[PDB]
């Protein structure tokens, strides 16, 4: 059915793309077998503060399977200027810088 928040690290496939619509589309590869789980992703201003400032366009990002190597597509509306796309937390948290002109 469905579990908590994904506990394993993710991996970015390619590089976030500009949709020319003010949003970015990125593909992630999940490495865990604990799904179905919710993807911990967010658009924050600085790494010094993980308070979500941007907004997810994709509805409640999820890994729908309990098999590894699952890939998920996400569209976000990061704030203007600098921000980071952060996935995961703790020791398995990863981020990707971004700047919206």
């Amino acid at each position: 059915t469905t579990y908590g928040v994904c506990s394993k690290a993710f991996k970015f496939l390619g590089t976030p793309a500009d949709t020319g619509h003010g949003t970015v589309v990125l593909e992630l590869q999940y490495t865990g077998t604990d799904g179905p789980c919710k993807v911990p992703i967010s658009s924050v201003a600085s790494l010094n503060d993980l308070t979500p400032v941007g907004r997810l366009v994709t509805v409640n990002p999820f890994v729908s399977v309990a098999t590894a190597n699952a890939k998920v597509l996400i569209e976000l509306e990061p704030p203007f200027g600098d921000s980071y796309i952060v996935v995961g937390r703790g020791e398995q948290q990863i981020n990707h810088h971004w700047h919206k002109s």
């Epitope: 506990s7 490495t31 865990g32 077998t33 309990a66 590894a68 703790g90 398995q92």
Partner: antibody, heavy 119, light 108 residues
Framework: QVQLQQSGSELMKPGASVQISCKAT????????IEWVKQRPGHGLEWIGD????????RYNEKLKAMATFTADTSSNTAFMQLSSLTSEDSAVYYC????????????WGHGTTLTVSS | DIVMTQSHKFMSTSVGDRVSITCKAS??????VAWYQQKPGQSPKLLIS???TRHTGVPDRFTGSGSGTDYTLTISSVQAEDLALYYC?????????FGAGTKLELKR
């Protein structure tokens, strides 16, 4: 330095119940899954189950003829495994392993604690 | 559950040669396979994760490769310190399963 110190080997009466401990140090205890792997002397490796120390979520190899229970004491950063109704079948070296951030593979193993079920 | 079957358990090779212990999974484990090395009276040691990712503290003479259902652990220029038991493990889904292991032996 990530390291796992397990409890010492032990001889238990069949039917009895035992608790193997696994003290984690050198890393954020709660952000990982501790795996429990079994290996009977002449056999290979078999997955007993794991536990997400940070949330307490457990996953057991349901099909194993053994009653296992995982608990994580985030206060002492120690993962335990309770094994009840012991059998000569459960006699084996039990390993404590840490599940890597990048998948259900273990990157750090304890030196294993040997459990012998015998009268 | 997913069954992991490795190539013949008692394989031989000569120091310096190249060997390959194979691992077959009863189904596509989507590249999610790891290899461990276990020396007499020692805890298993992680060698490869995700078919080809070489763990640190692991000499590059150890390379893994694989996908779908077949995975190979190649040891280029085998050494005497490589004598050990080698297991593959799929990390595609629970329950996690290991191969019976392959014992590397040398011809001299």
């Amino acid at each position: 330095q990530v390291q796992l110190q397990q409890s010492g080997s032990e001889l238990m009466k069949p039917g009895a119940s035992v608790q193997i401990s696994c003290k984690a140090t050198g890393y954020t205890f709660s952000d990982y899954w501790i795996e429990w792997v079994k290996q009977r002397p002449g056999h290979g490796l078999e997955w007993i189950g794991d536990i997400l120390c940070g949330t307490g979520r457990t996953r057991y190899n349901e099909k194993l003829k053994a009653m296992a229970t995982f608990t994580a004491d985030t206060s002492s950063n120690t993962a335990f495994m309770q094994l009840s109704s012991l059998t000569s079948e459960d006699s084996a070296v039990y390993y404590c392993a840490r599940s890597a951030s990048y998948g259900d593979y273990a990157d750090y193993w304890g030196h294993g604690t040997t459990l012998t079920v015998s009268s | 559950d997913i069954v992991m079957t490795q190539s013949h358990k008692f394989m031989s090779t000569s120091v310096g040669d190249r060997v390959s212990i194979t691992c077959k999974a009863s189904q596509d484990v989507s590249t999610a396979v790891a290899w461990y090395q276990q020396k007499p009276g020692q805890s298993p040691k992680l060698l490869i994760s995700w078919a080809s990712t070489r763990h640190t503290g692991v000499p590059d003479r150890f390379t893994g490769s694989g996908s779908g259902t077949d995975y190979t652990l190649t040891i280029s220029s085998v050494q005497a310190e490589d004598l050990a038991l080698y297991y593959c493990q799929q990390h595609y889904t629970t329950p996690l399963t290991f191969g019976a292991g392959t014992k590397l032996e040398l011809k001299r």
